[PDB]
Every structure is written in C-alpha cells, then in structure tokens.
C-alpha cells in the first residue's frame, strides 16, 4: 500500500460550495422570488419584487402599478384633477370626464418571473380590469378560480448551470389578451414533494410568523439594460431581455 | 303514448342560469365582499372594497380613511404643517398646536356592507379612536374581543330576488357612539356549515395562497347617486341609499 | 363566635383590579405590541406601532422608514429627481447619480420594543440593506434564518410593578453592525406555554380573521421627551429614554 500526497481539498470544497449554492433553493430557509416587471411608455422599468421563505400572495391595484406612484413618485405627468378624471373613466364605462383614454403613467407590458424551488402548480397570475372583478363584470358572477390564470406551463424557464431555476411569463396591456388598465394579483409557494405540509399543525407557526418576512421592493430603472447591469446580474435574479437573452 | 314536440329547452336553461347566479355565492370559488363607504364633508363618497374568495381581515388607519389620501389624492385642503399639527392633536390630548378641531378631509359617516354567503357570526367591525387602542385608552387594559363589535344582528339585510344577500351597517363619526377621528378594523369570512374547515390541514393552502387574492379597491364619487349609477348597480353590489332605497 | 364588621370590600376589589390589569397580558384577548422607534437626524422621532391579539409579522421598506414618507409627509428635503437619484445609489453600488451619500430623511438609529406576554423565542428582528436580500448580496445565497436576528436575549427588559413586561433593543444605522440605509423586518407572537396551539385546527380561524386586527400606527414627535409626555406614559407603553430611564 502507498500514500504520498494529499487529496485536492481546496477543489473538493469548491465543488461542495457550488452544489451548496445550486441546491440552496431546496432548503426551506432559502427564498422564493416573484418579480413583476413593468415596462413603461418611456421604456423605463418599474420592478416590484416579492419574496418569502415559503409563500407569496400579492395583489396590486392600478395606482400601485402605474408610474409615478406613492412608492415611486419620481415623475409628474398630471394634475390631481386630471388623474382623478382618468380614474373615474377607467373604473366606470363613460363615468369620467377625462380627455385621456390612456395615461402616460400606465405600463405598456409586463414580465412576471418566479425563481427558486417553486411549486409550479401553485403559480397563479391574474390581470383584472381596473374595476377589479374577477373573471366577470359582475360581483355575483365573479369567479376566483380560472385555469387560464394557472400560467405555469405557459412560462418559459431560464437556466443556470443547465438547471431550470426561474420561469418567465410576459404580455401586453393592450386590452387584447390582458386589460389595458390593469390590476394585478399573483401567488406562488415553494415546492413541497413530501407528506408534511408547511401549513400543517407543526409548521404553520413559521409560515405565519414570516408571512410578511420581507417588504415588497420597488425599483425604477432608466431602461432594461440598466436593470440588467445594476439589478438582475448583480443580485443573481434570472431574467429574460426584450431580445430574449437569458441574463 | 304520444310525443310530438320539444320541451322548452331555452327556458329551462334560463332557469338554470338564474339559479346558477343566485346560488354562485355558495361556491367556495365565488367572492365575499366588504365595502367601507365613507361619506365626506362635501357629500362625495370614498368607497373602499375588500374582497376574497374565503376570508377578509382589514384595518385602515386615519390617513387611509380621510380624503385626500395617498391612494386618492385628488383634493388639497391643508399644507404639510397644518396636517401634521392636526394629527398631533388627534393622537394625544392637547398635544398638537392645530387651530383645527376637525379636518375638512375627515368623513362624516360611514356605511359598512358585507355581501355574499357570509358567516354573519364572523362579521366584526370596530371604529377605534385615532390612538388605535382597542376598547381602552391604555395598552394593558386594551381588549380585542367586545360583543358590541360583532355587529351582525344590528345590520339591515338587502334582498335580491327576495333573498338576503347583503347586510348593511351605518353610523356617524360624531363622537357619540363612534369616534370623531376614526381608525377602522373589520373582518368577515364566508359561511361554512359543514365539518371540514377551510383552514384545516387540507384547505389551509388555498386560504393562505389567496390571502391577498385581490387588492382593496379605492374609489371617489361625486356623490351617492353617482356611485349608485356608476358603481353599485353597474357591478351588482347591493347598496342602501340615504333615503333608504335598496339598489 | 363574633361578627361585628364588614371586610374591606373596596380594598379587596382594588387588589383584584390591580391583578386584573397586571395579568390581562396573559389573556388571549389582550394585545401584544411591537414598536419600531426611529430617531431622525433632527432628533425628532418617528414611531411605528404594530399590534395584534396573537401574532405580529411586519416588514418596512426604506421609503416606509425615512421621514418624510407617504404616511408621514410633513417635511420636504428633496425634489423628485434628487430622491430618485439617491435611491438609485442605495439600491445598486455606483448605479445612481446622486450627490448625496446619505439622506436627510434617513433615521440615525432605532429602538425596537415588544410588550405584552410575548414569546421571547419568537422575537425576530432583521435590518436588511436597501437591496433587501437576506443575509447575502445574492438571491440564491440568501438565507431567512440567522441566529443573530433572534434578538430576545440581547434585549433589555423594562419592569412594571417589578414585572418584566416589555423588552427593548437598540442600534445605530451607521453601517457598522446595521445597514446605513435600512429595510426592516420583525415578528413576534404571544407566549403559549400550553399544548393547544393558536394555529391549530380549532384556533386558526381566530388567528386569520384577526391577522390584520389593527392597522400599524405611524406617529411623528418633536423629540423623545415629547413622545414620553404625549405617547409612552399616556398610553401605558413601556419605554427606555436616551439617558436610560424606564418610563
Ligand atoms: N500489506 C502490507 N503490510 C505491511 N506493510 C506494508 C504493506 N504494504 C505496504 N507496507 C509498508 O511496508 C513498510 C514496512 O512494513 P513492515 O516492516 O511493518 O511490514 P511487515 O512486517 O511485513 O508487516 P506486519 O506489520 O503486518 O507484520 C511500511 O512502510 C508499510 O507501510
Ligand atoms: N303502448 C303502446 N304499444 C305499442 N305501440 C304504441 C303504444 N302506444 C302508442 N303506440 C304507437 O302505436 C304505433 C304503432 O305501434 P305498433 O304497430 O308497433 O304497435 P303494437 O304492434 O301494438 O306494439 P308491439 O310492438 O308492442 O307489439 C306506433 O307509432 C307507436 O308509437
Ligand atoms: N358556639 C356558639 N353556639 C351558640 N351560640 C353562640 C356561640 N358562640 C356565640 N354565640 C352567640 O350567643 C348568642 C346566644 O346564642 P343561643 O342563646 O342560641 O346559644 P345556645 O342556646 O347556647 O346555642 P344553641 O342554639 O346551639 O343551643 C347568640 O348571639 C350567638 O350568636
């Protein structure tokens, strides 16, 4: 028998670290991420990130999606009255006196991205009209469950070291498939392939105590490349550009 | 035996549809609705609608109830300092330098309406003072459960095709039975008359994933008739006018 | 045997009342309180109070912690563009064009206080950077559970009639132990020393229906003494001053 040298400890640790990071997403103590990216009429982006170690349920009213808004109030396009009149019309057919069909403050389109060990069967995304009645114009007809809004399979995955680790969905607020004047709701939970649910008797505490684990982050970027440079690549958030590059 | 004609298929389907809509409220995939309607000093209305397929728990601070506010910022009555001074006084007895006892921005009265297959025993509504201490002036004395706030039986139902389908409660913010300078909390869940709870081991997932199913809707209407015309009747939200008409 | 006088009924009732109030905190129908106190650059205080009969989970983004903000908008230090540029830099290293390293609107330091029959093992407090990635600069590396953030033992209790009834934690936003440009998350639940959990099959209803029992209260005080005079002592919220007096 012979021994005359060390194993490549440094290299072995590097492999372990690479796997540690690639596989961290499976830990219940890592995060799942949901980004709502709004492409505005000046080509600037408004980014809304939700995150949680376990579960994400979010909704955004029209005035939380337009720019400027009270979270990102860095432009001015309308006086108080003009904005009021506009909203009057977006809520109720012909009920407003606005001279504006659409607002300069309104998004042109969106990209929705979920990242982490997500339960794809839980990925749910619904753009309501301004009036915020689900799948209907009417309160009693309204329905909260529509297969169309379970968008998992319609999404396009983004790969990292050949692993699907994020999923992307995009659309236009041009009224053809999605409302022109949007209200947006979404949800996603982390995958659980085992029997013991994270909302069961013993795990529900942690879920509730961290239900508001992190505030939603709002960000405003000059244009998409700026966000790629200063956000997506920087923070390790997988992202798909207009020209369809996975960054 | 004889057969020589069709049954009235079209008519039978109409009955089925009428029942489908009248009875949709019993489906766990329909909505329950909670409206907080604020009648302002100019007779305009501020409407806040909460909705969820299962459960609604909401609270609103004073600055989310007055108008203007950061959600509906379409008037201006005060400078920054004036508003600060006012609030200073509303929070702490004689702790503010305002020259204003009451704000032009504050509501005169309210109407609270729950609609859907609601669990009336869950209907809870509490107007705290500005200082937001429940049923007390003191933190340790404060109590979260008071029978007075379980308002179900005090409400007046509104009927649709002879069925009680919404319930209304009203009051004045004149300090006599309700605080002049209000903070408002309410809750309501859908009725469950069967054994298997929607927060049990198997149903809790759906409850949590849709906890923020829909954003609260904020709306501002010229006066009550405008809202009747452009909102209540339009959206099939049952409503009771000042003159007590069920619309 | 002899009887010739009454017991001291009035006095006995007083003892019972004193105990009633001292012990109310153990009732599930009392409140637990969480105060985030921000000491600003002008020595004014911004107070954020969260409260709930059972459970508190909260997070605050940078723009909900600075002053002025959309909840307390009673000062003006920057134009829209200046503020945007500042935030650009706080989010992304060298990604902003601001001439300002720090904002006049940003807090110097904080005091976090939990009060009531709190589960000290549930007390969790985390100041993230502006970029809001937990315990990391990177999305996949991010971790939601760090012992450092379970601050219970690091806190200093405040006594009332010799009973520990509130706990205080303080720190500076000077970037040395806590980020200069903070995002803040915390949680705490009421103590449960018995077997039947308040999130179990029978108790989960009440927890959820009162999840948003009370809105967060925002308050702005001239300086610490003003808050002591008009808030802390007034409302029976235990508090520790700069000079370390328990009020
Ligand atoms: N199979 C083996 N058994 C014993 N020594 C071995 C063997 N293979 C290699 N060696 C090496 O041979 C060298 C001399 O070993 P040693 O003189 O103890 O052998 P041995 O006397 O034959 O073995 P043992 O101790 O089993 O009687 C040592 O450096 C040892 O590491
Ligand atoms: N009870 C009945 N039994 C059979 N046919 C009937 C009856 N009532 C009405 N009819 C009609 O009478 C017509 C002639 O029927 P058919 O000549 O097959 O009667 P049948 O020979 O008496 O009956 P079966 O086929 O039972 O021997 C058919 O159009 C049929 O629909
Ligand atoms: N141990 C006692 N038994 C009876 N009376 C008592 C006693 N101690 C004090 N007294 C008082 O003595 C007074 C007279 O009582 P009473 O004349 O009924 O006594 P008694 O006839 O000795 O007792 P009993 O009714 O048991 O035969 C009463 O005011 C009573 O309250």
PDB file of C-alpha atoms in Angstrom, chain A residues 55-61 63-64 70 80-81 84 87-88 91-93 95 97 119 121-122 124 126 128 130-134 137-146 150 183-189 199 204 207-208 211, chain B residues 17 20-22 24-25 28-31 33 44 49 51 53 70-76 115 160 165 200-201 204-206 208-222 226 230-231 233-238:
ATOM      1  CA  UNK A  55     -45.279  31.535   0.403  1.00  0.00           C
ATOM      2  CA  UNK A  56     -46.132  34.583  -1.663  1.00  0.00           C
ATOM      3  CA  UNK A  57     -49.620  36.030  -2.172  1.00  0.00           C
ATOM      4  CA  UNK A  58     -49.761  39.567  -3.583  1.00  0.00           C
ATOM      5  CA  UNK A  59     -52.092  41.957  -5.309  1.00  0.00           C
ATOM      6  CA  UNK A  60     -51.510  45.393  -6.777  1.00  0.00           C
ATOM      7  CA  UNK A  61     -54.112  47.993  -7.563  1.00  0.00           C
ATOM      8  CA  UNK A  63     -52.292  53.050  -8.664  1.00  0.00           C
ATOM      9  CA  UNK A  64     -49.610  50.725  -7.335  1.00  0.00           C
ATOM     10  CA  UNK A  70     -46.710  56.885  -3.988  1.00  0.00           C
ATOM     11  CA  UNK A  80     -54.709  65.995  -9.227  1.00  0.00           C
ATOM     12  CA  UNK A  81     -57.913  66.619 -11.122  1.00  0.00           C
ATOM     13  CA  UNK A  84     -58.983  61.784 -10.844  1.00  0.00           C
ATOM     14  CA  UNK A  87     -59.521  57.007 -12.982  1.00  0.00           C
ATOM     15  CA  UNK A  88     -63.227  57.890 -12.971  1.00  0.00           C
ATOM     16  CA  UNK A  91     -63.450  52.377 -13.206  1.00  0.00           C
ATOM     17  CA  UNK A  92     -66.857  53.006 -14.785  1.00  0.00           C
ATOM     18  CA  UNK A  93     -67.672  52.958 -18.514  1.00  0.00           C
ATOM     19  CA  UNK A  95     -68.331  57.717 -15.982  1.00  0.00           C
ATOM     20  CA  UNK A  97     -64.737  63.413 -17.837  1.00  0.00           C
ATOM     21  CA  UNK A 119     -44.264  24.757  -6.864  1.00  0.00           C
ATOM     22  CA  UNK A 121     -48.702  24.116  -9.856  1.00  0.00           C
ATOM     23  CA  UNK A 122     -49.112  26.999  -7.417  1.00  0.00           C
ATOM     24  CA  UNK A 124     -51.094  31.885 -10.370  1.00  0.00           C
ATOM     25  CA  UNK A 126     -54.325  37.333 -12.973  1.00  0.00           C
ATOM     26  CA  UNK A 128     -58.027  42.088 -13.665  1.00  0.00           C
ATOM     27  CA  UNK A 130     -59.404  48.397 -13.149  1.00  0.00           C
ATOM     28  CA  UNK A 131     -62.820  47.541 -11.678  1.00  0.00           C
ATOM     29  CA  UNK A 132     -61.151  44.525 -10.063  1.00  0.00           C
ATOM     30  CA  UNK A 133     -63.942  41.985 -10.574  1.00  0.00           C
ATOM     31  CA  UNK A 134     -62.526  38.560 -11.196  1.00  0.00           C
ATOM     32  CA  UNK A 137     -68.135  42.397 -14.935  1.00  0.00           C
ATOM     33  CA  UNK A 138     -70.435  41.310 -12.068  1.00  0.00           C
ATOM     34  CA  UNK A 139     -69.970  40.721  -8.333  1.00  0.00           C
ATOM     35  CA  UNK A 140     -72.087  37.550  -8.053  1.00  0.00           C
ATOM     36  CA  UNK A 141     -70.858  36.080 -11.347  1.00  0.00           C
ATOM     37  CA  UNK A 142     -67.230  36.687 -10.353  1.00  0.00           C
ATOM     38  CA  UNK A 143     -65.051  33.593 -10.074  1.00  0.00           C
ATOM     39  CA  UNK A 144     -61.746  33.180  -8.254  1.00  0.00           C
ATOM     40  CA  UNK A 145     -60.539  30.008  -9.983  1.00  0.00           C
ATOM     41  CA  UNK A 146     -59.822  30.015 -13.725  1.00  0.00           C
ATOM     42  CA  UNK A 150     -52.548  28.978 -13.669  1.00  0.00           C
ATOM     43  CA  UNK A 183     -54.978  45.364 -11.554  1.00  0.00           C
ATOM     44  CA  UNK A 184     -52.560  42.526 -10.836  1.00  0.00           C
ATOM     45  CA  UNK A 185     -52.764  39.544  -8.475  1.00  0.00           C
ATOM     46  CA  UNK A 186     -50.330  36.616  -8.158  1.00  0.00           C
ATOM     47  CA  UNK A 187     -49.281  33.790  -5.868  1.00  0.00           C
ATOM     48  CA  UNK A 188     -46.660  31.119  -5.628  1.00  0.00           C
ATOM     49  CA  UNK A 189     -45.392  28.778  -2.896  1.00  0.00           C
ATOM     50  CA  UNK A 199     -49.099  24.739   6.807  1.00  0.00           C
ATOM     51  CA  UNK A 204     -47.955  26.697  10.387  1.00  0.00           C
ATOM     52  CA  UNK A 207     -45.363  30.218   7.882  1.00  0.00           C
ATOM     53  CA  UNK A 208     -47.496  32.826   9.704  1.00  0.00           C
ATOM     54  CA  UNK A 211     -45.855  35.803   6.290  1.00  0.00           C
TER      55      UNK A 211
ATOM     56  CA  UNK B  17     -78.710  30.138 -15.260  1.00  0.00           C
ATOM     57  CA  UNK B  20     -76.562  29.353 -11.183  1.00  0.00           C
ATOM     58  CA  UNK B  21     -76.027  33.061 -10.435  1.00  0.00           C
ATOM     59  CA  UNK B  22     -78.270  33.301  -7.354  1.00  0.00           C
ATOM     60  CA  UNK B  24     -72.943  31.027  -7.033  1.00  0.00           C
ATOM     61  CA  UNK B  25     -72.323  32.749  -3.700  1.00  0.00           C
ATOM     62  CA  UNK B  28     -66.052  28.483  -2.434  1.00  0.00           C
ATOM     63  CA  UNK B  29     -64.847  29.796  -5.800  1.00  0.00           C
ATOM     64  CA  UNK B  30     -67.030  32.881  -5.653  1.00  0.00           C
ATOM     65  CA  UNK B  31     -66.345  36.047  -3.687  1.00  0.00           C
ATOM     66  CA  UNK B  33     -67.325  41.384  -0.411  1.00  0.00           C
ATOM     67  CA  UNK B  44     -68.684  62.994  -2.034  1.00  0.00           C
ATOM     68  CA  UNK B  49     -63.850  47.498  -1.291  1.00  0.00           C
ATOM     69  CA  UNK B  51     -62.807  41.047  -1.413  1.00  0.00           C
ATOM     70  CA  UNK B  53     -62.881  34.022  -2.085  1.00  0.00           C
ATOM     71  CA  UNK B  70     -52.100  58.803  -0.783  1.00  0.00           C
ATOM     72  CA  UNK B  71     -54.440  56.331  -2.570  1.00  0.00           C
ATOM     73  CA  UNK B  72     -56.957  59.060  -3.537  1.00  0.00           C
ATOM     74  CA  UNK B  73     -55.007  62.317  -3.684  1.00  0.00           C
ATOM     75  CA  UNK B  74     -57.423  64.414  -5.762  1.00  0.00           C
ATOM     76  CA  UNK B  75     -58.076  67.312  -3.368  1.00  0.00           C
ATOM     77  CA  UNK B  76     -55.905  69.716  -1.335  1.00  0.00           C
ATOM     78  CA  UNK B 115     -72.204  40.663   0.585  1.00  0.00           C
ATOM     79  CA  UNK B 160     -82.146  40.289  -4.319  1.00  0.00           C
ATOM     80  CA  UNK B 165     -77.634  38.539   0.046  1.00  0.00           C
ATOM     81  CA  UNK B 200     -57.946  22.708   8.165  1.00  0.00           C
ATOM     82  CA  UNK B 201     -54.945  20.618   7.151  1.00  0.00           C
ATOM     83  CA  UNK B 204     -55.303  25.930   4.563  1.00  0.00           C
ATOM     84  CA  UNK B 205     -53.045  26.024   1.486  1.00  0.00           C
ATOM     85  CA  UNK B 206     -55.741  27.630  -0.665  1.00  0.00           C
ATOM     86  CA  UNK B 208     -53.087  31.324   2.503  1.00  0.00           C
ATOM     87  CA  UNK B 209     -52.136  31.330  -1.199  1.00  0.00           C
ATOM     88  CA  UNK B 210     -55.169  33.575  -1.863  1.00  0.00           C
ATOM     89  CA  UNK B 211     -54.964  35.607   1.345  1.00  0.00           C
ATOM     90  CA  UNK B 212     -54.138  38.677  -0.754  1.00  0.00           C
ATOM     91  CA  UNK B 213     -56.221  37.468  -3.699  1.00  0.00           C
ATOM     92  CA  UNK B 214     -57.393  40.956  -4.646  1.00  0.00           C
ATOM     93  CA  UNK B 215     -56.146  44.397  -3.766  1.00  0.00           C
ATOM     94  CA  UNK B 216     -58.501  46.710  -1.898  1.00  0.00           C
ATOM     95  CA  UNK B 217     -60.227  48.976  -4.391  1.00  0.00           C
ATOM     96  CA  UNK B 218     -60.376  52.706  -3.636  1.00  0.00           C
ATOM     97  CA  UNK B 219     -62.908  54.884  -5.486  1.00  0.00           C
ATOM     98  CA  UNK B 220     -64.059  58.501  -5.274  1.00  0.00           C
ATOM     99  CA  UNK B 221     -67.559  59.516  -6.433  1.00  0.00           C
ATOM    100  CA  UNK B 222     -69.115  62.989  -6.832  1.00  0.00           C
ATOM    101  CA  UNK B 226     -73.145  58.985  -8.942  1.00  0.00           C
ATOM    102  CA  UNK B 230     -71.662  54.117 -11.935  1.00  0.00           C
ATOM    103  CA  UNK B 231     -70.748  51.513  -9.327  1.00  0.00           C
ATOM    104  CA  UNK B 233     -75.944  48.969  -9.888  1.00  0.00           C
ATOM    105  CA  UNK B 234     -73.223  48.505 -12.526  1.00  0.00           C
ATOM    106  CA  UNK B 235     -71.194  45.930 -10.581  1.00  0.00           C
ATOM    107  CA  UNK B 236     -74.053  44.115  -8.813  1.00  0.00           C
ATOM    108  CA  UNK B 237     -73.051  45.360  -5.369  1.00  0.00           C
ATOM    109  CA  UNK B 238     -76.160  45.641  -3.196  1.00  0.00           C
TER     110      UNK B 238
END
